[PDB]
Symmetry: C3
Amino acid sequence: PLIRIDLTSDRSREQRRAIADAVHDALVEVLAIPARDRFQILTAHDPSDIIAEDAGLGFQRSPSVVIIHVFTQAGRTIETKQRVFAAITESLAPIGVAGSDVFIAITENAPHDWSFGFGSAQYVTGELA
Amino acid sequence: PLIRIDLTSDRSREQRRAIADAVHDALVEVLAIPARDRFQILTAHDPSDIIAEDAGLGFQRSPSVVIIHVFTQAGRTIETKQRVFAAITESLAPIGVAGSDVFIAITENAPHDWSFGFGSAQYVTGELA
Amino acid sequence: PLIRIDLTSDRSREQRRAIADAVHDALVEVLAIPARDRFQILTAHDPSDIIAEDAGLGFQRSPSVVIIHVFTQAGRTIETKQRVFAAITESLAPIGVAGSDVFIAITENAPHDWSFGFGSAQYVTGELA
């Protein structure tokens, strides 16, 4: 899967890397995805460039919001996805990201929509499972 | 929904926010979405990093292109999608984004593809309608 | 189609433009898309704010990784997508992008999910076919 992590620039770089580690450890845990199946783009913005309010659920976020957008193969179950949301959030708490400051989304495609390198579509050819 | 707004450096931080406020007012007034259901990433670029042509339609854009990318759950009609594009562009004309310089895309997922915080899928748990 | 090219800041801007010309030309070739159908967002990152491993396929990359994300309307075949992958990569090879440093994702939507300018949905109205 391809992960876009968009966060604010008050966070340290050590922590940005640790957030990226945590998001990835968590996807390996629940998806049982290979450990080197790791593709992430970390982007840091001024605090003012990311707006994430509460959707009227009755909480506030710090300005240090982490938005995590997972692009992944269709196939995963509703509960697998629920387990993904939980594992990521709990993976991030000991690392300094409060559960109120985590926003996750998934958007889906198919195995034939991926090229990991060399102009090749590895899921189509069978090189990747 | 989650909105990626990509625009150019020549625009002031005040216009950047006005832009985002307009994209969000448009979405509230056409989709009837909660006002606090606001999730946006603003990324400014050097003008040369955004390349948006006319698709052969015979018109000029300024260097100041504003690409707006809407990630939202499936459900909306063709017609509602037309009204969204219309309202976004009309919201933005009075702030000083020309109609030639706005580009909009929509990408869809399910309600089970969303976690607004705390590791929970609020559409799955019913914490959100 | 909307193309997001995420690459590394160490690349020289001329090269950044060349990488974008070559992705554009490659899609014109395989997809027979209008040449002025060119909508692309280049984002330069610090090298280590891109993480791209190998999915355990057994290969290394340099840090000058180039991730391309094609947002295109549905309807291309499995084989056409493979031709896309292969052509993007081959075009990028003479421009100082190793086959090992490329990553590609396609994510699909519908023709009614696009506004090319002016608040209008050109595929829906019929201004574009």
